[PDB]
Paper text:
D-Glyceraldehyde-3-phosphate dehydrogenase (GAPDH, E.C. 1.2.1.12) catalyzes the sixth glycolytic reaction. GAPDH shares an evolutionarily conserved fold consisting in two juxtaposed domains, an N-terminal NAD-binding domain (NBD) and a C-terminal catalytic domain. At the boundary between the two domains lies a catalytic cysteine residue. The active site of GAPDH contains also two structurally distinct phosphate-binding sites, the Pi and Ps sites, where inorganic phosphate and the phosphate group from the glyceraldehyde-3-phosphate (G3P) substrate bind, respectively, during reaction.
We have determined the first crystal structures of SpGAPDH at 1.50 Å resolution and CpGAPDH at 2.55 Å resolution. Both crystal structures correspond to the holoenzymes with the NAD+ cofactor deeply buried into the active site. The global architecture of CpGAPDH and SpGAPDH consists in a D2 homotetramer with O, P, Q, and R subunits, with three non-equivalent interfaces related by three mutually perpendicular axes (P, Q, and R). The conformation adopted by Arg233 in CpGAPDH allows it to establish interactions with the nearby Thr180, Asp182, and Gln183 residues. Critical active site residues in the adenine-binding pocket are poorly conserved between CpGAPDH (75AKSN78) and HsGAPDH (78QERD81) while nearly perfectly conserved in SpGAPDH (76AERD79). Besides the overall alteration in charge distribution around the adenine pocket, the most significant change appears to be the rejection of a positive side chain in CpGAPDH from the inside face of the adenine pocket. Taking into consideration that many known GAPDH inhibitors target the adenine subpocket, the non-conservative changes observed in CpGAPDH may have consequences for the binding strength and selectivity of GAPDH-targeted drugs. Whereas in the S loop of AvGAPDH, Arg209, and Lys210 stick out toward the NAD+ bound in the same subunit, in CpGAPDH a Lys residue substitutes Arg209 of AvGAPDH that points toward the protein–protein interface rather than toward the NAD+ cofactor. In contrast to AvGAPDH and SpGAPDH, CpGAPDH exhibited cooperative behavior for all substrates. Despite the sequence and structural similarity and roughly similar kinetic parameters, CpGAPDH was not affected by the concentrations used of either inhibitor.
Numbering used by the authors:
A (entry chain A): 1 to 331
B (entry chain B), C (entry chain D): 1 to 332
D (entry chain C): 2 to 332
């Protein structure tokens, strides 16, 4: 049994609990956030995007019990003050968005935790892993690691397949992304000074920056410095699409590209020929779902520009990858 | 030339500035918030609901200039620390949502301001004004006042007209309300513990509490304790509807009720027979817009239940009412 | 083993199919619509509100196979031309919205069908059933019956409980309703000339008329002519709320009313004290979900006004009620 | 100049809004499938473009706008309309069903002198993007096309790019507001598109567009050099055209932004403000280049260039349409 704590019971943290609660390999001992147990339990029970929790929840003072299993609730904003050493937690899932670095997240280790998995990009001085792309880099000795971004978990398998089959010279990624909690409800100042994430999330197409493409080198070293891109946040509650426009080493046809993708398909990376829309990927277990209906190739003179697209649920896809990586790290 | 400050450059503060900036009676000296001048200027220039500002904005350091007039910007979370005295500010529009009480809002007076107008309900010990309903209660000597809530400004003229013409013994109010910034973007803990405002604003029907009906007595004393109600927040960016289901002292007809409403119509209280929808009231100047097409009467054993509905833009309707009450207060 | 055809593979039809593949008592022989099998199969596999279908779907010329069982696809706009006798269908689920009457829906019988369940109000010359309110009236002699409206399936159990415990003299219903396929995507002319459903569905609060309250007289005869109401369509994809403001024959308390509701709770009528929002009822099997957090009472001069509310998934709640009524009709 | 409108839809009603205070045209008639009460109500109130600034009165079979009367008809077949009896000078074909010379010429048979089609209508006629190729107009044209909204956004941007640096090839992606050809909720679709069948306001909906492939009709040098697709997202109006392209010359972000600013005109605007989609609702530009979204990535000696332009797919296109209308009749 592996003792896990969750710091930051948000979209990712709560969905992580949903994925770990039924699997006997883990024991979620505690959850830390900024609120009381009643609030945490209600948010776990009811979800506007992922549906009702299938199980039973009851709340007790300073704790709540899910499926008969009790979980201590704490409210410490400073991780070094947490009781990880006292409950002897094995791994902390750092899901707050505030401690995404080796320096900052290591406060969990000083608090007594043996290992930490960060739910975001956390710099380049620690292992960053996209499951079924580079999880082989783990040997079990790593105290703090990053599960990368949702967008890298969508893009990496696609870019790796393209590079391995045809060699990818370069490309531009644009992700049409569901809005998230870092955007305002209505136009208002933003905490980090972003004048676009300041705007009403569900009423706008909101251009935004993302480093997923520039940082791919941390996951696929061969592609370091070969991709860039940005995002457009749009008014869907969850569900996103990654488009990649690129040039390859070899002339290709749509059929050849789609076949390479199907051949690279696994549990993390899926393949579909159905003309789906975003609402159809909510809650999927794949980290990436390649959409063969969106493959397009244009040729001028002898040079090809290739466009590919893969769906992902920035919540469920990422969290499933995060739990795959958590299982690998503790094995 | 009245020296105004705005504390909290939010939805209401920015729309207040929009309504005062063309207006010669006010000079807006300062704005206080929690961010820098470039952010306030950007948010004033571009609006997701109220459209782009028609005018020119330039950003200096620590201030910005609107249509050639400079406004100093400050970022002090504690109002008592504000430089209202040194700027000789006459009225502060308290629009943050954090000082809506006599005691808390009086810190502006301690900061050196002469008067404070609060843009929300602020308790029972202060004058609360819905313009063109009870604004005669103002005499000019009041240092702090409340402009009431958006729902109170929509409901009050409707309930006053019904009471005056037919006697309103009791009623229930329901406001189908646009979501606001006190609701979360996606499901998440909520600062004030509301498990319903914690849910994703633009994805849900969210029942919520409101004191607009219970507190109507502060605006229409004859109606103290005769109304109650609640809200349903729904996914529109702005624009709202107040429904009132009530019993009256007098049998009435649809035509009678509608005529009573039109007869009470003014700049604050409007009347329409067009089958409009919420997006059509965005930016209107009325504090309340009675919809004669929604009037319904049901009679059982000779006893009637009456349903009426009035539209409002919870932002522009309220802000226009607030500037009306401000002008009246400083013209006194 | 009862052979069922579905006419109109829409929101109600497709969800009916989702619920009947579970039940071995039915076999769905055919589906009729205005399009091909590829599209019907695709729309059945993927749903923006009710999620992906968990099961297997394959497409065949003029048919598609679900969980290994084949279903015939037809595209005849006129029901009299259907092959119901050839297929010997026992019951047709009439879900198009165009044949909602005894006279029009009897064309299914002329095509050779034994019985018709209309998924909408179909007039007062028919048996209209809200399961677990008046389904005891069914005896097997009925060629055509109506499953009533979604809103009546939400309101009836609540109104019945109120009437049974305390006597319901009169009441006004207001439903806060998800938008539907009879509203336009963007502002445009409307097929029925309604200037409000002509407006952009996902951008507005849209007042609308409904007979759900008046039609309660067909399901609860004691309450004939005692209720009326209206609707407000709001930008959620599915999930709705029914509010009721009413007067009773007896004085009551909030907890007394809530206790009566919990007591009347069953498979069709659910009871909750959780402060839920609309997205939380998507896909529920109840026809009505009474929300104890919304009960309120107003007392003035000793006469009370009572406000209660029930949630419903206007799609799944109604469809589950519809399948319950269909099983009841074919069991007799 | 006697202007009539066939199809009082999103484009038609906004066109009338723009022509009310233009002293050179007077609108004489409007044809649609509904009565004057509905048309007047839809002209008065609009969910995206706000209330009409003016007074509307509805007479018998006509309505008066700001004192000026306009008769209304209900003919689904354009050949049966009384353009001859009304001596119409130019008809705006805005239904979406007669987008071809052969079909739109029925206006000519009813007695219409000139027809401007508010959509792409084939290669047999002049298709014009104002301030891109409008000088091709002389007096002699009875039928012309105003192109698509997406072409009116892309064309000036692509032209500036070609003229300054030479566009080898490019892939366009437009993040587009949903439109009335998408379903409100999931349901069969009349043209069989399984994606436009899905609920418009709940999904990211990939869609095809010919705006890129057809650019050759507006900029002949670029025939067969661009392609692209669309993504429909839940905003009521407002759209963004992103272009990923390769150029003949090596460039810098500053060079591209300067070349765009140099091309600035009433049709093609320039901004460095970090705006969002709702900020372009109702703008008078056919295209608004966004300098904040320019990106260049370089691998070996080869560059990929990304640029983006906003447009209000309704107001931008309609403003362009009436500009082309004025030009067409000046001659
Ligand atoms: N949401 C996504 O789509 C997504 C996808 C991939 C990665 N991530 C990453 O996951 C992390 C969490 O994101 P989220 O979407 O779940 O956001 P969220 O806002 O939903 O979750 C944040 C939670 O952390 C809690 N928290 C904040 N400060 C805290 C502190 N000092 N101590 C304890 N708890 C605290 C908050 O109260 C909130 O409950 C972020 O770094 C995000 O970048 C998010
Ligand atoms: N939005 C409506 O529909 C509406 C209608 C009528 C009244 N009101 C009331 O107006 C008030 C403001 O609401 P809003 O909708 O504009 O909300 P908002 O969140 O958009 O505005 C809040 C603003 O106040 C600022 N702020 C917070 N604390 C501050 C402090 N200590 N000092 C300076 N600035 C601070 C924030 O940075 C933000 O700019 C609330 O009390 C609300 O109840 C709102
Ligand atoms: N959706 C709800 O919330 C709800 C609730 C209760 C009752 N109902 C009732 O159910 C009925 C269907 O509604 P819906 O929401 O599923 O609408 P919908 O528009 O999704 O379904 C209509 C379907 O019927 C098909 N159709 C139309 N005419 C036809 C014909 N002549 N022959 C064969 N097929 C035809 C259409 O192609 C479409 O697929 C309506 O009467 C509605 O009022 C709907
Ligand atoms: N909406 C945009 O963003 C946009 C941009 C550029 C071009 N267009 C083009 O403009 C045209 C109209 O699009 P829209 O957005 O106005 O759609 P819309 O659905 O709002 O307008 C269609 C109108 O035409 C009427 N109509 C349909 N058939 C008719 C007939 N036979 N006779 C007379 N009237 C008829 C309908 O009643 C409706 O009022 C389309 O061809 C579209 O491609 C649209």
């Amino acid at each position: 049994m592996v003792k896990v704590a969750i710091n930051g019971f948000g979209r990712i943290g709560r969905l992580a609990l949903r994925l770990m609660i039924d699997n006997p390999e883990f024991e979620v001992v505690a959850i830390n956030d900024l609120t009381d147990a009643k609030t945490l339990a209600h948010l776990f029970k009811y979800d506007s995007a992922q549906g009702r929790f299938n199980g039973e929840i009851e709340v007790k003072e300073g704790a709540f019990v899910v499926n008969g299993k009790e979980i201590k609730v704490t409210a410490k904003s400073n991780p070094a003050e947490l009781p990880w050493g006292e409950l002897g937690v094995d791994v902390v899932l750092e899901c707050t968005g505030f401690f995404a670095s080796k320096e900052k997240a290591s406060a969990h280790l000083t608090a007594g935790a043996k290992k930490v998995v960060i739910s975001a990009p956390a710099g380049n001085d620690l292992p960053t892993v996209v499951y079924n792309v580079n999880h082989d880099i783990l040997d079990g000795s790593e105290d703090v690691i990053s599960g990368a971004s949702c967008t890298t978990n969508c893009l990496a398998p696609m870019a790796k397949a393209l590079n391995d089959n045809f060699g990818l010279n370069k490309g531009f990624m644009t992700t049409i992304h569901a809005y998230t909690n870092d955007q305002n409800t209505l136009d208002a100042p933003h905490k980090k000074g972003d004048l676009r994430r300041a705007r009403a999330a569900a009423a706008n197409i909101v251009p935004n920056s993302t480093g997923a493409a520039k940082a791919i080198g941390l996951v696929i070293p061969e592609l370091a410095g070969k991709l860039d891109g940005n995002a457009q946040r749009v008014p869907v509650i969850t569900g996103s699409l990654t488009e990649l426009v690129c040039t390859l080493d070899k002339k290709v046809t749509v059929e050849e590209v789609n076949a390479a993708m199907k051949a690279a398909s696994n549990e993390s990376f899926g393949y579909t020929e159905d003309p789906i829309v975003s609402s159809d990927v909510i809650g999927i277990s794949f980290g990436s779902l390649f959409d063969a209906t969106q493959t397009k190739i244009m040729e001028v003179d002898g040079q090809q520009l290739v466009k590919v697209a893969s769906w992902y649920d920035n919540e469920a896809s990422y969290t499933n990858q995060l739990i795959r990586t958590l299982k690998c790290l503790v094995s």
